[PDB]
Structure 1
Amino acid sequence: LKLGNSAIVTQEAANYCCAYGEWPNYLPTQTATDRFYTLKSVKWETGSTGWWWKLPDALNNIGMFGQNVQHHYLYRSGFLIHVQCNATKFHQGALLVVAIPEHQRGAHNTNTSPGFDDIMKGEEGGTFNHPYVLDDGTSLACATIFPHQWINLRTNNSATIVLPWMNAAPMDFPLRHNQWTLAIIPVVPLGTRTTSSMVPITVSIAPMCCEFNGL
Structure 2
Amino acid sequence: DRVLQLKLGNSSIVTQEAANICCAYGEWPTYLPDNEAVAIDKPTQPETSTDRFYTLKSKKWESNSTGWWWKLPDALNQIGMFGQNVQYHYLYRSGFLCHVQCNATKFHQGTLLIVAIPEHQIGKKGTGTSASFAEVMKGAEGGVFEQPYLLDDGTSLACALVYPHQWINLRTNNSATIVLPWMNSAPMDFALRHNNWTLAVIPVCPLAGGTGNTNTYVPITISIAPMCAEYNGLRNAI
TM tier relative to shorter chain: over 0.9
Any idea what the Cα deviations from partners look like across 1:121-166, whole Å, max 9, x if unmatched?
0001000001000001110000001000011101111100000000
Q: TM-score scaled by structure 1?
A: 0.97
Q: 1:209 maps to what in 2?
A: 228
Q: Where does residue 134 of structure 1 map in the other structure? A: 151
Superposition RMSD on alpha carbons, in Å? 1.0
Identity %, equivalent residues: 79
Kindly indicate which of the two structures has a greater share of residues assigned to strand: 2
Q: CA deviation at 1:14?
A: 3.8
Gaps of 5+ in 1: none
The answer to whether residue 119 in structure 2 is matched with residue 102 in structure 1 is yes
Moved over 4 A (4+): none
Give the match's secondary structure for 1:132: helix
Q: Residue 100 of structure 2 aligns to which amino acid in structure 1?
A: V
1:117 alignment partner in structure 2: 134
Q: Secondary structure at the match of 2:222?
A: strand
Q: 5+ residue gaps in structure 2?
A: 1-5, 34-43
Task: Give the 5 Å matches for 1:70-109.
Answer: 70-109=87-126
Separation in structure 2 between the aligned mates of residue 104 and residue 195 of structure 1, nearest angstrom: 36
Check the 8 A contact 1:95/1:150 in 2, yes or no: yes
SS of structure 2 residue aligned to 1:178:
coil
* Higher Cα radius of gyration: 2
In structure 1, what residue type is equivalent to 2:55? T
Identify the match of residue 55 of structure 2 among 31, 34, 38: 38
The one-letter code of the counterpart of 2:233 is G
The residue type paired with residue 228 of structure 2 is: C
TM, length-normalised to structure 2: 0.88
Structure 1 equivalent of residue 41 of structure 2:
none
| 1:11-66 C-alpha deviation (Å, 9 max, x unpaired) | 33441000001110111221110000001111111010000000000000110111
State the partner residue of 2:13: 8
Q: Distance in 1 between matches of 2:159 and 2:114?
A: 13
Aligned residues: 215
